[PDB]
Amino acid sequence: KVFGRCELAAAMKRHGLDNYRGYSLGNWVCAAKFESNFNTQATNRNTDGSTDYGILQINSRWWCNDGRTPGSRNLCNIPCSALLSSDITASVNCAKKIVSDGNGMNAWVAWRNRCKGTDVQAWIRGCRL
Template sequence: MRTLLPKTFLLACIVATIQAKIFGRCELARVLKDHGMDGFRGYSLANWVCMAFFESGFDTKAIEKNEDQSQDFGIFQISSDWWCKADIPSENLCYISCNELLNSNIEDDILCAKRIAADPQGMEAWDKWKTHCQHKDLKKWVNGCTF
């Protein structure tokens, strides 16, 4: 019994590691393109890739704590204040648990990002997009990628 606990813990760590993913730039661009993000609500694919880089470094397990006690989750840093359900009261407008945004399957992240972009604020909901991507030449985010 004594040796079972460390092995179980190690297995749990390995499984958690397998579920998260750090995407490559072109790999993410292909996934986003395949899910209809290129041109969604007038935003180019490069906008989405740029935003994901500055929000999470393409890391699906990224979590950021905010001053108001809310947190941002996943590759698009989706806020628990409005969009997903965490430990604090939330509007949960994407009808999803924030923890579901932390795995390598980003289909639910994409659906929620589309919901956010469909609001009047559009991509301006992401502060790091406004700072690093809006009104910038974004060609470098998709240059060299094949689709």
């Protein structure tokens, strides 16, 4: 499922991400856009042999089990295939853990390189919260 810009903001605000650890909604919407293009089914194999899964491209090295990442933690206790659901719940609850683990949204390279320090307000422009 490829969400719309305003559609994903709503599901995101609802599952409790707006101001989560002091990151406003636009930051999460911007990260989704540059990670997955809002596609819940997005996967990207990394040179390291891990894979990033879903709307927030959560990585198999640390966070989820895809049964093929050689040496790999499963912090979030889920198979990576539950990050590809059209319901973003599982992606969201894993994202709260990730963002809580010290580095905040720097965990998402696409956030640090493209969203950090820009007007992320514009990403929720014309959406009903």
